[PDB]
């Protein structure tokens, strides 16, 4: 069983992703948040296997949260509306294992979580096509 | 509590698939189709005639707003989804019954569909910002 914390400011996606991931037999959403501070606080206290975060959030950003959680054993998957090529390097240095676009199929999300748990790095193909 | 057929038109595929999954769990609802453009919504609604169409106001090709205006005299009840004024008035004139923000709780969505089906106007309380 994979324990997942989800930090997303847009409540409709937060609740919809939480419902989606909970239907998986090997996944459990153990907590939900709306700010980067919520992610830092939960991860440091509860130590989930995976943290799914929006790159942009009020208070502390998903990126600032990722950097603060760099030395925890938690696997960070970043969600972004835009490819944000200029912010991707900061995410790599932060130790982000997954970097996904909100235009990616929802089916690939559970697969990304499982891949990241198997020590693989999952990046949006659009970001390679954008960066190169 | 007759079954409600829903079509979802959303360009961000992760929200499209996640919303489709969430609404399908409801006993009185069925997601009969999914689309990524405004033309997909116009084409689906005109051919398959769903009870409700959930649309993102901004989409590639034809927008959710242009689609809503084209589908004004159909029978289909439009609920608009938006991330972010003049676009709200254009929706009311187009006959849009529902106007929700992506920052609204996902639980408001099923309830909105049911309310719109009962002839009510649903505008997200979150919309009244400042
Ligand atoms: K589960
Ligand atoms: K975003
Ligand atoms: K159903
Ligand atoms: K939008």
């Amino acid at each position: 069983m994979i324990s997942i914390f989800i930090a997303e400011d847009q409540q409709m996606l937060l609740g919809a992703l939480g419902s989606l991931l909970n239907l998986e037999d090997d996944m459990e959403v153990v907590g939900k948040g709306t700010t980067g501070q919520d992610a830092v606080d939960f991860v440091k206290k509860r130590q989930p296997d995976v943290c799914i975060m929006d790159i942009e959030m009020p208070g502390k950003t998903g990126l600032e949260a990722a950097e603060e959680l760099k030395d925890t054993g938690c696997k960070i998957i970043i969600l972004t509306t835009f490819a944000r090529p200029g912010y991707f390097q900061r995410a790599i240095k932060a130790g982000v294992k997954g970097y996904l676009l909100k235009d990616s199929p929802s089916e690939e999300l559970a697969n990304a979580i499982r891949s990241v748990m198997n020590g693989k790095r999952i990046y949006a193909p659009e970001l390679m096509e954008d960066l190169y």
Side-chain angles (χ1 to χ4, degrees), chain A residues 29-46 48-66 68-69 71-73:
Chain A
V29 182
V30 294
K32 285 185 275 181
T34 51
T35 76
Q37 198 56 252
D38 289 342
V40 171
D41 291 341
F42 191 93
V43 175
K44 284 181 168 165
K45 174 189 61 166
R46 287 274 306 274
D49 297 314
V50 174
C51 179
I52 299 165
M53 271 195 286
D54 197 303
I55 202 170
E56 51 140 314
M57 278 185 293
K60 205 161 266 179
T61 63
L63 245 181
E64 288 155 342
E68 211 162 320
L69 299 170
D71 296 315
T72 73

Side-chain angles (χ1 to χ4, degrees), chain A residues 3 17 19-21 24 27 33 38 75 79 83 92 94 109 125:
Chain A
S3 55
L17 289 181
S19 159
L20 182 73
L21 302 176
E24 296 295 304
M27 285 171 200
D38 289 342
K75 288 175 181 85
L79 287 196
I92 281 217
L109 183 58

